[PDB]
Amino acid sequence: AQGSHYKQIIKNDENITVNESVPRGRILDRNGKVLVDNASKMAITYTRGRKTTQSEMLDTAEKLSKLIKMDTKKITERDKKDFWIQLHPKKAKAMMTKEQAMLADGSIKQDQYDKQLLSKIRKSQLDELSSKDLQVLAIFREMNAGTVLDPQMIKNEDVSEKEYAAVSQQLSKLPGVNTSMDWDRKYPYGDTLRGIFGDVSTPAEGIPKELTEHYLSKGYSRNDRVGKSYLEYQYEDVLRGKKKEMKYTTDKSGKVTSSEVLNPGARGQDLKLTIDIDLQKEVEALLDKQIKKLRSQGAKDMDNAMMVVQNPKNGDILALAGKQINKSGKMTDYDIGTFTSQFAVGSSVKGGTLLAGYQNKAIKVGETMVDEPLHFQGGLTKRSYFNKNGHVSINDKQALMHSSNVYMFKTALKLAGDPYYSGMALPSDISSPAQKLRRGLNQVGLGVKTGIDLPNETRGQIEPLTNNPGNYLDLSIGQYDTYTPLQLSQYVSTIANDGYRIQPHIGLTIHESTNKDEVGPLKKKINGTVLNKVNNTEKEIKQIQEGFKMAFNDKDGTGYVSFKDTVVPTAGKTGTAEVFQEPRVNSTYIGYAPIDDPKLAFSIVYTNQPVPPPWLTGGDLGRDVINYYFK
Amino acid sequence: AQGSHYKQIIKNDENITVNESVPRGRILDRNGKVLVDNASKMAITYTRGRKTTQSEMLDTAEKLSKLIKMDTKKITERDKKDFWIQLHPKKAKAMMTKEQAMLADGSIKQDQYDKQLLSKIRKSQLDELSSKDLQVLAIFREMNAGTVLDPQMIKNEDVSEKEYAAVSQQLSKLPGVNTSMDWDRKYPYGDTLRGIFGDVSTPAEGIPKELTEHYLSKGYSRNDRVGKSYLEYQYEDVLRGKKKEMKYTTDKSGKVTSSEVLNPGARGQDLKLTIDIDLQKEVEALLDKQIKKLRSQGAKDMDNAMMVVQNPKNGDILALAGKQINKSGKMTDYDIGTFTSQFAVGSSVKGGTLLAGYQNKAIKVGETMVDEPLHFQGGLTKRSYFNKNGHVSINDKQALMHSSNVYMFKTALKLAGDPYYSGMALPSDISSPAQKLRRGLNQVGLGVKTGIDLPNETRGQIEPLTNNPGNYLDLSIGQYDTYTPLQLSQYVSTIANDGYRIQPHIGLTIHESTNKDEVGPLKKKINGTVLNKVNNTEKEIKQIQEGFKMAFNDKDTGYVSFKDTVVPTAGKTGTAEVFQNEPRVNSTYIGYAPIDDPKLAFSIVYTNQPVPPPWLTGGDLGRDVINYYFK
Ligand SMILES: *C(=O)[C@@H](NC(=O)/C(=N\OC)c1csc(N)n1)[C@H]1N=C(C(=O)O)C(=C)CS1
């Protein structure tokens, strides 16, 4: 049942052509819950003239009230205090007897008279909780809330076809008031995923200005409403309603002699997402719990927290996040930062390095070498769980259990053809190893786009790596190149997939149009495409995941405190990263579950925690979310 | 120039198919100078293992040295120490007499022994290596990255089509050596744009692992050489040539009874770039001296310096950046930084912010309200650049002249609805004004991608703006949202072009696959597509131009370097602010040449100057290039 809003009427000669918008297709979750739908809405606006008074507007506002209801609480204290002085000038004067007298002294200007008039107001605020009053104030404030020639929205609410028929003319009679029918996205899960859904351009907006070339080259008219961010933008091609076009031929007189249909119109196609709306809501809830499930232990300048959850075998996405500006602890939605923002993630990249170190014949599978502080001409890398002494024979799994920097430092040196000896100079051209290393990490999704079906993905900050070898070893340890939370997810995921990097997607399937049927027959499956397989043997592969188990299933394994065991076995790796806000830390967690046939994977990023890490426990987020899913 | 080289030989029951490989298209500057050519090359390769006593492996390397000459660039210090030890067990054991005993005493083990030896060998004795030794070694090191049964590369040697035969001998007569003929790229301007040009994959690697599906989805076999970095990857469709494909019918005895040719092959299409290389080579030269010209004044870890030069009509005429360490000398090529990297940029954003003012009628075309060291709440928190000088009267065009970083601050509030009053509250929701401002910036390129024809362009780090209006004011003054040098360039250039944002492109023209070396018939022209106009009006853009015109032709920043020289240049300056270690500062520069009929636009970015006060003539590099271009 495709709807009909007149969008564009052009007169040529005796021809008049008419275009009607039709509803876009819906966005639904992996189970069919409507996430984005459509609503027919009337929009009533005021357009305040050059010389239009306050008595002018309060009057229109009054007639406007006996005609539509408003929601109160946009009203401020000042709105009410001003409205009161506006409504009760006789009553208000009496409180300012001295000041009205000293207004004509010249003792005071109005600008300080008006401020004491506001100071003496209280029980008279209730003198207009006469809800009839607040209604008028509701409308009136918007009529004063804006630019002169610009029209101003007063109400955009659901309207029927007959409703608009009865009231539009009698709204339009009032000076400044216009009405229009509009298509508007409606969002049952309110604020959930809204960033990811993106918006469609307003009727005021054409095609958005900076997007002209973009939409004009694909055939649009500048008047067309289009998707302009994220999901509405990304799947504009399928979500869009192909508009109705009619060409009328006319008499001289105006009489339509003939009519032809250029396009009857097509209600947009419905898009299903990989997202389980419930899981989504739960994760946002757990993330808000966990963020101060520290009561700010110290973390009151943690400024971002990120979570991505995914099916590591088909790249389905079930995942969101949000930031924390704790000049408060008052959070916003940083939904998209999961694949649009770049963070130093530190030690959680260590599995990729070993893989890099395997395929270049730099270390071998099971390699057992020893570790201890390192010494160069100045430069002094101690790993940080023994910096001074205590020299331990350690293999590649164990190095991941402990998250031992010096093992990764030693492999890095071996990858440079320059194995460690105390007092060696740092190899001065590290171009070649750095390249071998990066291509290693690139294979599991680190430093390359994941390919996700959404706009604005970043691959991370990638600075020259030629003759600062310290940055080279930083890289082997996650303290040079910045990565993305989605990249981290793609990376564990390929480990759990026995080496298959898969292109993540929040797109699930594409169906055909209906106004009713919350199915709609299938048109397109959106597949999690295999991108490549790691250049490594199963044994090389298995070793990283054996290591990953015993960082979560073993004891000094740096993920026991959060993952020790829970309702299903979980393998992973973690990360603490030095950065400068003033000095602070980044905390990172990646994992997957269950070990024997994985079905979930996730990445976690907390930014700018104050913490040295024998105190902080963020991947309890990981533990809690994984419990919910599997039970 | 011309030819085919054997790539693939396939049997199926007396029917052999032979695929020969062809040269790629050339890359040229705007006037037709050859940047990237092809050369026909001999790939000498070592593949031995299992009988590796390594002493014979050196013997092969010794043998090989009598046949080939080697560039010695790649020899590391370690290479030399290991080799020196092997060459003089005599000399080394004479330095290890204390440690000799300890090994036999039992107190020390062989690994420690070898480790101590390595520290005792200094560079003075490394000089005892002969030029011929350093030739054997150069070969040797390549053959000791050697996995037992896996071929490593020794030399790529420009040998003719008809002397390959004479020398092809060295095949299982020196053991591991395999020889083969491959098409390789040639660079007659050395390293001068190498990153931008990019790389094509080795005949060994075929399609690189990370790129597998990307190229397999295009019908490539996995054995195909492909474009893997930058321009090589970007214009792969045009640059690659069509293979020569032969088909023969043998009988049982191998005798060719028929043959057919399916494709004779042809060199790939020639790519003409918009770059002028003399112009390109000058900027690098100029850019070089200009960072030395801050070696003096303290730029200790200024670690980045970038320049982008262009105009509307065709192209990126120029693009160089480098990066530095520790002023330790070391520059390393970072041209790709101009569009891939994200830098806090400062006041140069003001031109666009002043237009976001016009669009939302927060300002008028000429507007005069004045500057105060202005404060709000907390008990201290306030504003800009001098604390007392309550300065007056400024035009907006006067505001960019001074770079009045307070007129902007006022403008923001006046766009967020509530102009300044001394002692005012913060707005607590700044979503809407942040959005309009950001919109405004995207219009002139700031905050979206430019649309350049290279991979990995970043649009800058863009964090949530809702409820920290501390950050929202920074955005007015280029201190919340990082852009790229290219983004600045498209932006300044949008002003030069009277409000018309153009999509930069480095490709000028694609030419038909020609077999014989003159650049062939025009196949495609790569255009500077107008993405959009600002919905800022005729007179409103002209002010921003005048504003620009008057901080270059008097006001006091921009005079200190653009003190009218060769040039009616108009432009704008930016000083930023970075606490990423310790309070450094970013220094940025935009501007455009001959103001009447503008022919050149430029953008500059210096990162991490330790030096705040507005004294450094870093924008001289800017003034310099215009002298060249306008002769
Ligand atoms: C533009 O962004 C302005 N930058 C600053 O004022 C610096 N931080 O600003 C938030 C400030 C300058 S030095 C000190 N260390 N931080 C400058 N814009 C122009 C200019 O030409 O760059 C000048 C008016 C100086 S202010």
Ligand SMILES: *C(=O)[C@H](NC(=O)/C(=N\OC)c1csc(N)n1)[C@@H]1N=C(C(=O)O)C(=C)CS1
């Ligand atoms: C990985 O990079 C971890 N290293 C660190 O966390 C320290 N910086 O490393 C360069 C960090 C400790 S706190 C101080 N601010 N710097 C290693 N991996 C794990 C981990 O989960 O982070 C730990 C064993 C610490 S070391």
